From a paper:
In epithelial tissues, the cadherin intracellular domain binds to β-catenin, which in turn associates with the F-actin-binding protein αE-catenin. Specifically, αE-catenin functions as a force-sensitive structural switch that displays two-state catch bond behavior: it transitions from weak to strong actin-binding states between low (<2 pN) and moderate (8 pN) forces. The structure of αE-catenin comprises a series of α-helical bundles organized into three main regions: an N-terminal (N) domain that consists of two four-helix bundles (NI and NII) that both binds β-catenin and mediates homodimerization; a middle (M) domain consisting of three four-helix bundles (MI, MII, and MIII) that harbor binding sites for vinculin and other protein partners; and a C-terminal, five-helix bundle termed the actin-binding domain (ABD)18,26. The interactions of αE-catenin are allosterically modulated by binding to its protein partners and by mechanical load.
Therefore, we determined the crystal structure of the αE-catenin 82–883 dimer at 4.0 Å resolution without dehydration, and also examined its structure in solution by SAXS. The ABDs in αE-catenin 82–883 crystals were disordered, and the protein is extended in solution, demonstrating that the disorder of the ABDs and the extended nature of the molecule are not due to the absence of the first 81 residues. Superposition of the individual protomers in each αE-catenin dimer crystal structure shows that although the N- and M- domains have similar structures, they assume two different orientations with respect to each other due to differences in the N-M interface formed by the NII and MII bundles. Cysteine labeling provided evidence for this coupling: upon binding to E-cadherin•β-catenin to NI, C228 in NII becomes significantly more exposed in αE-catenin. C228 packs against Y237, which is directly in the interface with MII, so changes in its exposure may arise from changes in the NII-MII interface. Murine αE-catenin has 12 cysteine residues, which the crystal structures reveal have variable levels of solvent exposure. Mass spectrometry revealed variable levels of mBBr incorporation at the different sites that correlated only weakly with Cys side chain exposure observed in crystal structures. This may reflect dynamics of the molecule in solution vs. the conformation observed in crystal structures. Notably, Cys 324 and Cys 337 in MI, which have limited solvent accessibility in crystal structures, label strongly; this region is also proteolytically sensitive, indicating that MI is relatively unstable and flexible.
Numbering used by the authors:
A (entry chain B): 83 to 264, 274 to 357, 361 to 635
B (entry chain A): 84 to 264, 275 to 354, 361 to 635
The structure:
């Protein structure tokens, strides 16, 4: 940092000389507000002084990058040392001297991130700083669990996983800072392309052998749409409708194909075909929206349930049940990630797609860590620190699930969720009244749980999409309907269901009032519908 | 000019900030090792930079407004120059215009070199060049519309020039205004080659497919413009399509290889760079293809139109105007194509400026033919056609030598040698088949391409300074011109004489083939001589 200092003093002397020149020229113009020459000399000095100041400030930029490289190498060595800890005394010291350098690095890297220009590097820098700050205090506890219970290898796997993520964050900072030289969804991009790429006459030899076949674009679009509609998370309803829409958007293209193949005239018969094609593409767009809303309303319930089953089986020292429920938990996490990926696919917003994919990837990286933490707790169940690790990883899991949930909420339309959840909760209150009408205790319990979960989901979604607007009268009425369904309708419905289940599962079968139960169910539905209409007022399209 | 108030505001601001920065820099240099004083120096430097950049953008906006007012002045003065009724009033409006038009041209040059864009730069350059070259032409068009008020051709020409100047001033307005954002296709091609790789480990399959696929498709469109062109050989565009499919396959292969991560995937990247370089070479070969194949006959439709308009035919001169327009468009195509792939930025600017100038000049010669066919006896028709043909041939050779200086000479020599070998075999086989039109056309083509070679090597050997390398190739070119073309034109005309007559005598076919192999070997020899610069 010495050559930089000398050349920076050089540049600052340059800048002071230019400032003297600029002051002289400006004082000379200040006398003649009319001389087009004094004005010319003023601007000619301004440009050169601006160039000199720019030289100096880019020297300062290079100096800050120089400092950040060695700070990053310092924290790299510190991470390597905190990993290679011997006992809880050397480890407890490596942390009391790494946090200062970690914080200095984080601040300098935020500075350099604000100094960047390319936004991909901005986000790489932000994610690297975030992973750094999240994993250093977690690498501490992982190394502590390694050194206290060295008999379990799951702790070693977690220590090494967090160390690898930390080194990846180090290298990400390095490249996002050093490299100073120089966005919608996948299905939405191709859908808008195919919407616009059907306006040219392809009988010519200029866009039938160079540009892609207007059939191949549709075929890859169908590949994506049937990838979504074949997901294990898709209902049969959306699947049938997506099949219908794919076969109706291939018929509107074959109609358009036989319209452009026989025209080749610079025509009107093909305007009907292009309008039909536009409308069929818009309809398949809407159907993919309906399918992803199906996914959001369905799979985003019982969010932290496999985790709870896993930790409850791991609190009891079990080993094979832990592996079974851990494979199940990995599967459910991958189900969440697949749903988030489909919703990222059909989405147009550039920022939301990035947040969704990044949060889902972080949750995917967290999945094996909490699996190993549950395994290591079950391996040493009568341990304090294993219990603490399990608690920490369960809280991390709940937080990551909540942030992925909010990302998918904000990346999608509010009233679409309102309507799909309204119809689903109607189907479910019907399932509930039916399970009661035949005294099906299991069906009644399951359906009431589904109804309550969907209600709480809708309340969280409505309160999340209600903060995007200013505190006003519309928000007042909407949040009033929300808290009314909150503190009234759902507790009443729950008490009704509990009374019915108690009346069924008793030594004397008690004839509960079947009338008020149905009233609480229809109250759930009508509250959902009321809130839906309340949110559906401040917009006209 | 009412903004000078904010100017003095920003001047006082910049003075205060510069004094503050000089004080802070003195504090730093007096204590060269202080994290606080250095920080304050940098803070003051950034504040001073913000102040002087505010001042700079204020000055640029003042520049822009004064240019807008000058442009409105020139526009209204041109409106006066067109509607002038007297030659006295036309002279007075031109007297009041010429300095104001020069002022507008200088200001437009300033705001062109100060444009934050690279394309609107060229647009306004061409527009103000049109305004620079056509106002003195509107003067004479109006003088000849006020001196022959009967011939509607003179009025059509005057008003065509007026509409062109109005397009020029509106273009200057639109270009210098909206600064809101090498060559057309070469830029995207080199940036494709820049974006082929980024980061192996943090590589997402759904974050780079848009960039790479869309870049590939834009490149494919830019190359299809050149391959599927009015003047580009069939085999050439088939070769281009082959290389386009190859580069598409290579892009998809590079995508499927970046799906696996950074070891064995280097081969896919090398194949990608190979395919993009080979497509670059095929496009350059296509440009060189329609250079020798289109620049050999420059004044043909002009000459035929001039003769058929001097004779006064109406239908003939109209068909010749259409062939003249087809020729001008066929040449503008080659201009834009050779521009879109060259990295010589200033050369591209010059070529495109000359190309738009000639594009505007074409309908002027059209209306000159209009004036000649309608009044062939009239005194002013001769001078009108003479001026416009002079300007036309001037701009033709200007665009020729302008594209010559963005086109590598060695590729020109290669494509010219292969093309004249092709035409010489055509000529031989037409002499053995005894085709009078065949020999006529083939000898014309060979002689024209040889003259093309002569002109390009003459215009290229002046960029060097006379030495052994200079004279060694100058001798070959002089030998070609003053030896083989005589001995070839002589043989082919002896053929068309003895064959297209009664005796049908064998026109000494061995000497004919001797002259043909002579012209091939002479072009090849000039090539071999001038190619003694470097090997890598």
């Amino acid at each position: 940092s010495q050559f930089l200092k000398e050349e920076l003093v050089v540049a600052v002397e340059d800048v002071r000389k230019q400032g003297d020149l600029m002051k002289s020229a400006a004082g000379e113009f200040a006398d003649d507000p009319s001389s087009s020459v004094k004005r010319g000399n003023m601007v000619r000095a301004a440009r050169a002084l601006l160039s000199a100041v720019t030289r100096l400030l880019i020297l300062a930029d290079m100096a800050d990058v120089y400092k950040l490289l060695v700070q990053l190498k310092v924290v790299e060595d510190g991470i390597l040392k905190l990993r290679n800890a011997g006992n809880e005394q050397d480890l407890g010291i490596q942390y009391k001297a790494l946090k200062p350098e970690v914080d200095k690095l984080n601040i300098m890297a935020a500075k350099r991130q604000q100094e960047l220009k390319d936004v991909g590097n901005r986000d790489q820098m932000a994610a690297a700083r975030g992973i750094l700050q999240k994993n250093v205090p977690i690498l501490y506890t992982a190394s502590q669990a390694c050194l206290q219970h060295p008999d379990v290898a799951a702790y070693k796997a977690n220590r090494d996983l967090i160390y690898k993520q930390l080194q990846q964050a180090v290298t990400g900072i390095s490249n996002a800072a050093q490299a100073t030289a120089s966005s919608g969804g996948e299905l939405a991009y191709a859908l808008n392309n195919f919407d616009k790429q059907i306006i040219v006459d392809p009988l010519s030899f200029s866009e039938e052998r160079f540009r892609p076949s207007l059939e191949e674009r549709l075929e890859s679009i169908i590949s994506g749409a049937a990838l979504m509609a074949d997901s294990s998370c898709t209902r049969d309803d959306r699947r049938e409708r997506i099949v219908a829409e794919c076969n109706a958007v291939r018929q509107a293209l074959q109609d358009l194909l036989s319209e452009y193949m026989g025209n080749a005239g610079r025509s009107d018969a093909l305007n009907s075909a292009i309008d039909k094609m536009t409308k069929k593409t818009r309809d398949l767009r809407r159907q993919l929206r309906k399918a992803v809303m199906d996914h959001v309303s369905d799979s985003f319930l019982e969010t932290n349930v496999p985790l709870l089953v896993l930790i409850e089986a791991a609190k009891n020292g079990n080993e094979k049940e832990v592996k079974e429920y851990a494979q199940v938990f990995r599967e459910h996490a991958n189900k969440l990630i697949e749903v988030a990926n489909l919703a990222c696919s059909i989405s147009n917003n550039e920022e939301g797609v990035k947040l969704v994919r990044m949060s889902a990837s972080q949750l995917e990286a967290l999945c094996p860590q909490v699996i190993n933490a549950a395994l290591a707790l079950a391996a040493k169940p009568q341990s304090k620190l294993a219990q603490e690790n399990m608690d920490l990883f369960k809280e991390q899991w709940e937080k990551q699930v909540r942030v992925l949930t909010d990302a998918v909420d904000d990346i999608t339309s509010i009233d679409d969720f309102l309507a799909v959840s309204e119809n689903h909760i109607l189907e479910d209150v019907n399932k509930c009244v039916i399970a009661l009408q035949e005294k099906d205790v299991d069906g009644l319990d399951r359906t009431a749980g589904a109804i309550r979960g969907r209600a709480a989901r809708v309340i969280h979604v409505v309160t999340s999409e209600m903060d995007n607007y200013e505190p006003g009268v519309y928000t007042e009425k909407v949040l009033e309907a929300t808290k009314l369904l909150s503190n009234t309708v759902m507790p009443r419905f729950t008490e009704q269901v509990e009374a019915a289940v108690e009346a069924l599962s008793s030594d004397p079968a008690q004839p509960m009032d079947e009338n008020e139960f149905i009233d609480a169910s229809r109250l759930v539905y009508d509250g959902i519908r009321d809130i839906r209409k309340a949110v559906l007022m401040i917009r006209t399209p």
